[PDB]
């Protein structure tokens, strides 16, 4: 998605988290904007030494490397839950014998 997400000079609209207190569980979503305390002195919302903002903006330029250029990724999660099947394929059904 370099063509759409890249503009002259680079796009910074998309962020990613750099630090977190612990390992994320599968399908776990944190969106808090708290200051990250990498040190011993609590930040209490105060940045500085060992108090960084966990997010960092991507640099997506048209001249960036292919490994640095933006990519759009979709993750489809499949489940067979306690219910009749709801999402089915284009298969054509037949009469019963």
């Amino acid at each position, epitope marked *: 998605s370099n063509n759409l997400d890249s503009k002259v000079g680079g796009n910074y*609209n998309y962020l990613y988290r750099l630090f977190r207190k612990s390992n994320l569980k599968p399908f776990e979503r944190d969106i808090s904007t708290e200051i990250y305390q990498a040190g011993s002195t609590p930040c209490n*919302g105060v940045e500085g030494f060992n108090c960084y903002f966990p997010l960092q903006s991507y640099g997506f330029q048209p001249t960036n490397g292919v490994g640095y250029q933006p990519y759009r990724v979709v993750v489809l999660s499949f489940e067979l839950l306690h219910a009749p099947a709801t999402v089915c394929g284009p298969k054509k059904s037949t009469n019963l014998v």
Partner: nanobody
Amino acid sequence: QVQLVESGGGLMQAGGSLRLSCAVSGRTFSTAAMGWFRQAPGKEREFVAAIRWSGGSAYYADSVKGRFTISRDKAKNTVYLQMNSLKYEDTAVYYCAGSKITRSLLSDYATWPYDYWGQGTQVTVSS
């Protein structure tokens, strides 16, 4: 929805120390950038200091380089301007502003418009 509440400054001697604040409420400036301006009588509003919010890189005008310093806090949602080594010419009405556009060059934030402006606070430097 978005309010930029300024504080600090005032009248003091030359070379004094001040640190202007501009509290940001209802919005974050992560991908865009924030900037400071001042407006002296009979003059146009002039650029002083602009900073990228996420990255922390600073950009200063030649009238303020080495004398004024810009800093920000993200959780408190406040930007500061450390006003050291004052001069007589620095007397003006200072305007905090935040942009809605993500500009690739932090230098483009010195001229490109800001869609949020503060109320304005006077700063006077005396003999």
